[PDB]
Amino acid sequence: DIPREPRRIVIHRGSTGLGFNIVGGEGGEGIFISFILAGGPADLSGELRKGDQILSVNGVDLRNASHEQAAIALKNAGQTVTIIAQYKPEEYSRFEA
């Protein structure tokens, strides 16, 4: 169900944040989802995966952003957050395995 090209995914922040954690933002590695919280917003969308690269959070481009810049952008993105994600599990595994 997950396409190759970037996709838009809307999620609502809750008491466990957006329901995922991130790695990367250094060297050749962009911002990747490393963990999806069971029952959290990202999981309930059914539309975000470990190994997704986050390209944008709302309008904030994360393609050339450090980890802390990405974490701040995600923290400050509000209650309703539109993530542009692109699924890159092989690249994720190269950097993280």
N, CA and C atoms as an extended XYZ file, in Angstrom:
291
Properties=species:S:1:pos:R:3:atomname:S:1:resname:S:1:resid:I:1 pbc="F F F"
N         0.815       -1.205        0.000 N   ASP     1
C         0.000        0.000        0.000 CA  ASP     1
C         0.853        1.261        0.000 C   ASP     1
N         2.127        1.141        0.354 N   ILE     2
C         2.999        2.301        0.521 CA  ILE     2
C         3.683        2.582       -0.812 C   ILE     2
N         3.456        3.742       -1.417 N   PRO     3
C         4.060        4.048       -2.713 CA  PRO     3
C         5.531        4.418       -2.573 C   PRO     3
N         6.191        4.473       -3.728 N   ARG     4
C         7.593        4.881       -3.796 CA  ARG     4
C         7.753        6.388       -3.625 C   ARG     4
N         6.818        7.184       -4.142 N   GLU     5
C         6.990        8.628       -4.164 CA  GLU     5
C         6.507        9.252       -2.869 C   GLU     5
N         6.836       10.532       -2.647 N   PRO     6
C         6.404       11.185       -1.410 CA  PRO     6
C         4.896       11.176       -1.275 C   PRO     6
N         4.451       11.067       -0.035 N   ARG     7
C         3.039       11.027        0.295 CA  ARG     7
C         2.774       11.957        1.463 C   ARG     7
N         1.537       12.441        1.518 N   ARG     8
C         1.067       13.357        2.544 CA  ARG     8
C         0.283       12.583        3.589 C   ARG     8
N         0.554       12.880        4.862 N   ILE     9
C        -0.077       12.169        5.969 CA  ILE     9
C        -0.369       13.173        7.074 C   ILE     9
N        -1.641       13.295        7.445 N   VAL    10
C        -2.080       14.198        8.503 CA  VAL    10
C        -2.226       13.429        9.809 C   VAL    10
N        -1.628       13.938       10.873 N   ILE    11
C        -1.819       13.317       12.170 CA  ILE    11
C        -2.004       14.370       13.241 C   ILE    11
N        -2.647       13.938       14.303 N   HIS    12
C        -3.042       14.810       15.404 CA  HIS    12
C        -2.241       14.466       16.641 C   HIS    12
N        -1.573       15.473       17.187 N   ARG    13
C        -0.763       15.287       18.378 CA  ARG    13
C        -1.649       14.912       19.551 C   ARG    13
N        -1.112       14.064       20.411 N   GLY    14
C        -1.808       13.651       21.598 CA  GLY    14
C        -0.888       13.567       22.791 C   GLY    14
N        -1.334       12.833       23.794 N   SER    15
C        -0.608       12.798       25.046 CA  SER    15
C         0.715       12.060       24.947 C   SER    15
N         0.963       11.341       23.851 N   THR    16
C         2.245       10.697       23.584 CA  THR    16
C         2.910       11.300       22.345 C   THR    16
N         2.684       12.591       22.119 N   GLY    17
C         3.261       13.284       20.988 CA  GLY    17
C         2.635       12.849       19.679 C   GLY    17
N         3.452       12.864       18.623 N   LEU    18
C         2.994       12.437       17.307 CA  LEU    18
C         3.072       10.927       17.141 C   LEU    18
N         3.651       10.218       18.108 N   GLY    19
C         3.667        8.771       18.071 CA  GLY    19
C         4.787        8.156       17.265 C   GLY    19
N         5.900        8.863       17.099 N   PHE    20
C         7.056        8.266       16.446 CA  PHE    20
C         8.310        8.996       16.897 C   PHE    20
N         9.449        8.349       16.693 N   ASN    21
C        10.742        8.945       16.997 CA  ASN    21
C        11.618        8.912       15.760 C   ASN    21
N        12.623        9.780       15.749 N   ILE    22
C        13.420       10.025       14.557 CA  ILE    22
C        14.905        9.849       14.811 C   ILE    22
N        15.607        9.512       13.737 N   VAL    23
C        17.058        9.416       13.687 CA  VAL    23
C        17.527       10.176       12.445 C   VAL    23
N        18.844       10.327       12.345 N   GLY    24
C        19.460       10.914       11.178 CA  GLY    24
C        19.693       12.404       11.267 C   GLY    24
N        19.668       13.070       10.110 N   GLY    25
C        20.029       14.471       10.047 CA  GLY    25
C        21.506       14.742       10.150 C   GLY    25
N        22.332       13.823        9.679 N   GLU    26
C        23.777       13.987        9.761 CA  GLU    26
C        24.424       13.252        8.602 C   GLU    26
N        25.547       13.787        8.140 N   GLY    27
C        26.234       13.182        7.015 CA  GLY    27
C        25.310       13.067        5.824 C   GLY    27
N        25.274       11.878        5.245 N   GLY    28
C        24.401       11.591        4.133 CA  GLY    28
C        22.996       11.146        4.490 C   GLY    28
N        22.624       11.176        5.767 N   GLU    29
C        21.351       10.647        6.237 CA  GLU    29
C        20.389       11.782        6.570 C   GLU    29
N        19.241       11.792        5.895 N   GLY    30
C        18.164       12.688        6.244 CA  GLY    30
C        17.438       12.243        7.498 C   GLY    30
N        16.250       12.779        7.723 N   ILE    31
C        15.482       12.505        8.933 CA  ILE    31
C        14.605       11.292        8.667 C   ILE    31
N        14.800       10.236        9.445 N   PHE    32
C        14.069        8.994        9.299 CA  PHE    32
C        13.281        8.632       10.543 C   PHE    32
N        12.107        8.055       10.321 N   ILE    33
C        11.341        7.458       11.403 CA  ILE    33
C        11.996        6.147       11.805 C   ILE    33
N        12.389        6.044       13.074 N   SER    34
C        13.024        4.830       13.566 CA  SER    34
C        12.099        3.985       14.425 C   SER    34
N        10.971        4.544       14.857 N   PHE    35
C        10.107        3.900       15.837 CA  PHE    35
C         8.711        4.489       15.712 C   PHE    35
N         7.706        3.626       15.693 N   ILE    36
C         6.312        4.043       15.694 CA  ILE    36
C         5.654        3.474       16.940 C   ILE    36
N         5.109        4.361       17.759 N   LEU    37
C         4.502        3.970       19.022 CA  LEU    37
C         3.170        3.264       18.805 C   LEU    37
N         3.052        2.060       19.367 N   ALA    38
C         1.808        1.310       19.284 CA  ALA    38
C         0.680        2.139       19.876 C   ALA    38
N        -0.367        2.358       19.084 N   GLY    39
C        -1.533        3.086       19.535 CA  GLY    39
C        -1.431        4.588       19.427 C   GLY    39
N        -0.281        5.111       19.035 N   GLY    40
C        -0.124        6.535       18.887 CA  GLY    40
C        -0.706        7.030       17.582 C   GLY    40
N        -0.638        8.344       17.385 N   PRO    41
C        -1.260        8.925       16.180 CA  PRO    41
C        -0.688        8.399       14.875 C   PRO    41
N         0.638        8.270       14.784 N   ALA    42
C         1.247        7.793       13.550 CA  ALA    42
C         0.808        6.374       13.244 C   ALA    42
N         0.755        5.526       14.266 N   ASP    43
C         0.300        4.156       14.069 CA  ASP    43
C        -1.148        4.113       13.592 C   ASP    43
N        -2.017        4.947       14.171 N   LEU    44
C        -3.435        4.890       13.826 CA  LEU    44
C        -3.711        5.430       12.427 C   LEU    44
N        -2.850        6.315       11.911 N   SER    45
C        -2.972        6.711       10.514 CA  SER    45
C        -2.804        5.508        9.595 C   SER    45
N        -2.017        4.519       10.024 N   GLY    46
C        -1.727        3.357        9.205 CA  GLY    46
C        -0.911        3.752        8.003 C   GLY    46
N        -0.384        4.974        8.004 N   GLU    47
C         0.209        5.558        6.814 CA  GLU    47
C         1.669        5.954        6.972 C   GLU    47
N         2.270        5.761        8.146 N   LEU    48
C         3.673        6.074        8.375 CA  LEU    48
C         4.405        4.825        8.839 C   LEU    48
N         5.665        4.699        8.433 N   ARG    49
C         6.421        3.486        8.698 CA  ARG    49
C         7.835        3.789        9.162 C   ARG    49
N         8.384        2.893        9.985 N   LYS    50
C         9.820        2.857       10.187 CA  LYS    50
C        10.507        2.801        8.831 C   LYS    50
N        11.508        3.645        8.629 N   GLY    51
C        12.153        3.733        7.334 CA  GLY    51
C        11.605        4.787        6.397 C   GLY    51
N        10.542        5.484        6.782 N   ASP    52
C        10.128        6.690        6.083 CA  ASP    52
C        11.130        7.803        6.356 C   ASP    52
N        11.514        8.511        5.300 N   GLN    53
C        12.208        9.782        5.422 CA  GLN    53
C        11.161       10.882        5.480 C   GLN    53
N        11.298       11.760        6.458 N   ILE    54
C        10.432       12.930        6.560 CA  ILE    54
C        11.045       14.048        5.722 C   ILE    54
N        10.345       14.455        4.663 N   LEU    55
C        10.819       15.519        3.795 CA  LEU    55
C        10.382       16.898        4.263 C   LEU    55
N         9.194       16.991        4.853 N   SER    56
C         8.634       18.267        5.272 CA  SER    56
C         7.632       18.041        6.391 C   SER    56
N         7.560       18.998        7.314 N   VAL    57
C         6.580       19.022        8.408 CA  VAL    57
C         5.894       20.345        8.274 C   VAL    57
N         4.602       20.218        7.894 N   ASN    58
C         3.901       21.383        7.381 CA  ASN    58
C         4.762       21.963        6.258 C   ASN    58
N         5.129       23.233        6.356 N   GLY    59
C         5.956       23.833        5.330 CA  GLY    59
C         7.439       23.776        5.594 C   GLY    59
N         7.868       23.156        6.693 N   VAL    60
C         9.275       23.237        7.092 CA  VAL    60
C        10.022       22.096        6.397 C   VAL    60
N        10.947       22.446        5.506 N   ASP    61
C        11.727       21.454        4.766 CA  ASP    61
C        12.741       20.815        5.700 C   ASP    61
N        12.724       19.489        5.768 N   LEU    62
C        13.670       18.762        6.605 CA  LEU    62
C        14.705       17.968        5.813 C   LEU    62
N        14.791       18.191        4.503 N   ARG    63
C        15.709       17.420        3.676 CA  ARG    63
C        17.167       17.757        3.964 C   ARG    63
N        17.448       18.927        4.528 N   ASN    64
C        18.825       19.345        4.809 CA  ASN    64
C        18.860       20.006        6.187 C   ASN    64
N        18.413       19.235        7.177 N   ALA    65
C        18.217       19.687        8.540 CA  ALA    65
C        18.889       18.731        9.512 C   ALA    65
N        19.442       19.281       10.585 N   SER    66
C        20.027       18.445       11.613 CA  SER    66
C        18.905       17.766       12.404 C   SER    66
N        19.288       16.788       13.213 N   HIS    67
C        18.319       16.103       14.053 CA  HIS    67
C        17.611       17.079       14.980 C   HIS    67
N        18.361       17.968       15.629 N   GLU    68
C        17.725       18.879       16.572 CA  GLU    68
C        16.824       19.863       15.841 C   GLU    68
N        17.211       20.313       14.640 N   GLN    69
C        16.313       21.165       13.867 CA  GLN    69
C        15.010       20.439       13.550 C   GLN    69
N        15.090       19.148       13.199 N   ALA    70
C        13.887       18.374       12.920 CA  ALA    70
C        13.042       18.190       14.166 C   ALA    70
N        13.674       17.867       15.295 N   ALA    71
C        12.914       17.653       16.519 CA  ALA    71
C        12.189       18.925       16.928 C   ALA    71
N        12.844       20.077       16.777 N   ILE    72
C        12.193       21.346       17.092 CA  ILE    72
C        11.031       21.600       16.143 C   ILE    72
N        11.235       21.357       14.841 N   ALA    73
C        10.149       21.556       13.890 CA  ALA    73
C         8.955       20.683       14.236 C   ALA    73
N         9.199       19.417       14.594 N   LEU    74
C         8.098       18.527       14.956 CA  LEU    74
C         7.417       18.990       16.239 C   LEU    74
N         8.204       19.421       17.234 N   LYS    75
C         7.643       19.868       18.509 CA  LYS    75
C         6.747       21.079       18.317 C   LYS    75
N         7.146       21.988       17.437 N   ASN    76
C         6.467       23.257       17.272 CA  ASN    76
C         5.406       23.239       16.185 C   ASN    76
N         5.132       22.071       15.609 N   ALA    77
C         4.233       21.988       14.475 CA  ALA    77
C         2.739       22.081       14.742 C   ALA    77
N         2.388       22.067       16.009 N   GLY    78
C         1.005       22.219       16.421 CA  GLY    78
C         0.328       20.881       16.697 C   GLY    78
N        -0.988       20.965       16.859 N   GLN    79
C        -1.875       19.842       17.135 CA  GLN    79
C        -2.201       19.028       15.881 C   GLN    79
N        -2.332       19.737       14.724 N   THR    80
C        -2.600       19.013       13.481 CA  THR    80
C        -1.386       19.172       12.580 C   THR    80
N        -0.764       18.057       12.203 N   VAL    81
C         0.536       18.091       11.546 CA  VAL    81
C         0.463       17.339       10.230 C   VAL    81
N         0.933       17.975        9.164 N   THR    82
C         0.966       17.358        7.848 CA  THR    82
C         2.409       16.988        7.548 C   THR    82
N         2.664       15.696        7.428 N   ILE    83
C         3.997       15.166        7.169 CA  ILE    83
C         4.064       14.732        5.714 C   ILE    83
N         5.128       15.139        5.027 N   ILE    84
C         5.432       14.632        3.703 CA  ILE    84
C         6.535       13.606        3.908 C   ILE    84
N         6.244       12.342        3.615 N   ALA    85
C         7.145       11.234        3.889 CA  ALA    85
C         7.440       10.485        2.601 C   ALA    85
N         8.626        9.887        2.535 N   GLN    86
C         8.990        9.055        1.392 CA  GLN    86
C         9.658        7.797        1.920 C   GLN    86
N         9.133        6.642        1.532 N   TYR    87
C         9.521        5.373        2.136 CA  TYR    87
C        10.829        4.878        1.532 C   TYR    87
N        11.871        4.764        2.361 N   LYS    88
C        13.208        4.406        1.892 CA  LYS    88
C        13.823        3.378        2.840 C   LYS    88
N        13.209        2.198        2.935 N   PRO    89
C        13.678        1.216        3.926 CA  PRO    89
C        15.085        0.709        3.685 C   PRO    89
N        15.526        0.610        2.430 N   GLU    90
C        16.881        0.129        2.182 CA  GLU    90
C        17.923        1.161        2.597 C   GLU    90
N        17.700        2.431        2.262 N   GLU    91
C        18.600        3.481        2.718 CA  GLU    91
C        18.595        3.588        4.234 C   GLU    91
N        17.418        3.486        4.848 N   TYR    92
C        17.334        3.498        6.297 CA  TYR    92
C        18.213        2.412        6.894 C   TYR    92
N        18.100        1.195        6.367 N   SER    93
C        18.866        0.080        6.916 CA  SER    93
C        20.364        0.278        6.725 C   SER    93
N        20.781        0.883        5.612 N   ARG    94
C        22.206        1.123        5.409 CA  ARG    94
C        22.772        2.055        6.474 C   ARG    94
N        22.020        3.086        6.848 N   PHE    95
C        22.523        4.028        7.844 CA  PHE    95
C        22.351        3.525        9.268 C   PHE    95
N        21.315        2.730        9.533 N   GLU    96
C        20.906        2.429       10.896 CA  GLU    96
C        21.194        0.996       11.312 C   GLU    96
N        21.468        0.111       10.363 N   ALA    97
C        21.883       -1.252       10.670 CA  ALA    97
C        23.393       -1.351       10.496 C   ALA    97
